Design a binder for this molecule. Structure first.
Ligand SMILES: [Zn+2]
Lengths: 288, 307
């Protein structure tokens, strides 16, 4: 059922596991993600940026998310606006039926980040909708003050040695923390088949951080790369094929295969049935 | 609004135009088709084969079609099951909200085709849903007198005819039977459908081959031939390979010119736009442009009275 971020991450915090939050932009991406979380009976957060909403003209993505919610009634599913920039973007998402939003004003000075975030929280909490915010190396007492002044349900913090910082931020704020954004397999495949990926690019570190309070792990690039590597492989190996199902299907399955190990490591496997999901309407009571 | 094939093709037949019926399998393909028909203010048939519904777990495609219906309220849009094989596949499509279904029993002897088709017609007409059937294969070309008898015995709303086309991008080695079309049209009195009608336009094929694809001998139906058939009674023209080639060609181009890109929106976006650009002159040629505002669409519930 549609689930709030507050309830889904509160459960993860209480049982020391993290939930993957996967950016989705079209049908094959949502299908690849849901096959993994359903196979591992894990809750999931589907997230969409304002750009993803533009790409799908808003309505197509809303309807694909309704499809997931209907096809897998027993999986807690949070639909979340990633990297929201303004109250106007938040209103737009809540209107589409989202159950959570991120208001990212972390590039602003502290007081202005608080001002903008507070306004979003008032609007969202009145509808039962959860709010994630960010504060950007983060003094734990500054994190505590920010959460006190704003009332956000979750806090993305600048992470990095200092794992007791994560622990301290989690203990002082008392709320779920979020960790924002590269497999050899995917990387090698893309280059093998014509790609030119940056020389950029550790799971253990993420596991370590979950144990101290990180409850939401954002994954976007990895899925994009899995799909692209799979399509490039079909294009080289079978150049006569032109039906999109012939390369998007393999791309959809690469996403699922790349996600299974991650979900297992984050620890949310098996937890989908742990709690009765609270509706947005019943959630309004949490905020009085 | 959601429209029946009987209404949409009846208008097409009365005014001597044809309506493109485009297979869709996902979001970007629907978006590409809708942008073209909305630009041209034309009717449109979005069709989903049983394979497309498998690919989309049924519900994702049902919801994407709803998104199209909601986003473009004033365009008559028929949601049609392409190449249904059994009454069970037809009940499934109707349950998903479709307004039209094709029952293809053309590979069965005449009497069996008639029997399987009658079963579908009874269930579909009882819900106001239109029915397309096929007599002739694709090589059994359609016999005009037999087509007249089949329609009288089945009551279908539209008949797919066999005149030389076929599915796929390699329809000819380097033709067709359009004289039969007028005769079938006159004898049956109903809208006719032409399957395997992608044209494999030059722009699209050249792009695939320029950027690593291997389709040097792809050949489609010339647009002039389809325009001629429309003038003789063809009202629905099925197009699938052309959209597939357009998307694939555009993705291949991005992959070569910009090997650094790996976000699917960066290549499926250009894919979607290529479908739209490919469809615009085709829709103009079919003659359906500017006709989306011609009639008030009858709901499936009201359409039950027709039967
Ligand atoms: Zn066909």
């Amino acid at each position: 059922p549609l689930c709030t971020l507050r309830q889904m991450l509160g459960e993860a915090r209480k049982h020391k596991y993290g939930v993957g939050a996967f950016n989705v932009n079209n049908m094959e991406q949502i299908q690849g993600i849901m096959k993994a979380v359903v196979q591992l009976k894990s809750p999931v957060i589907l997230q969409c940026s304002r750009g993803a909403l533009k790409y799908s003209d808003m309505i197509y993505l809303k309807k694909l998310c309704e499809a997931a919610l209907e096809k897998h009634p027993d999986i807690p599913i949070c639909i979340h606006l990633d990297h929201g920039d303004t109250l106007e973007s938040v209103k737009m998402a809540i209107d589409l039926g989202f159950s959570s939003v991120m208001i990212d004003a972390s590039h602003h000075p502290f007081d202005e980040n608080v001002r903008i975030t507070k306004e979003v929280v008032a609007y969202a909490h009145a509808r039962s909708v959860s709010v994630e915010a960010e504060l950007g190396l983060t003094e734990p007492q500054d994190a505590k003050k920010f959460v006190e002044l704003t009332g956000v349900d979750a806090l993305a913090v600048a992470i990095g040695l200092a794992i007791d910082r994560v622990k301290t931020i989690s203990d002082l704020t008392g709320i779920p923390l979020v960790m924002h954004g590269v497999p050899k397999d995917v990387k090698d495949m893309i280059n093998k088949y014509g790609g030119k990926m940056p020389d950029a690019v550790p799971i253990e570190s993420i596991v370590h951080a979950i144990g101290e309070g990180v409850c939401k792990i954002n994954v976007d690039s990895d899925s994009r790369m899995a799909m692209t590597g799979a399509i490039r492989k079909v294009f080289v190996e079978h150049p006569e094929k032109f039906d999109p199902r012939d390369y998007l299907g393999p791309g959809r399955d690469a996403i699922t295969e790349m996600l299974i190990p991650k979900i297992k490591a984050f620890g949310s496997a098996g937890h989908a049935g742990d709690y009765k999901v609270v509706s947005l309407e019943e959630a309004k009571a949490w905020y009085k």
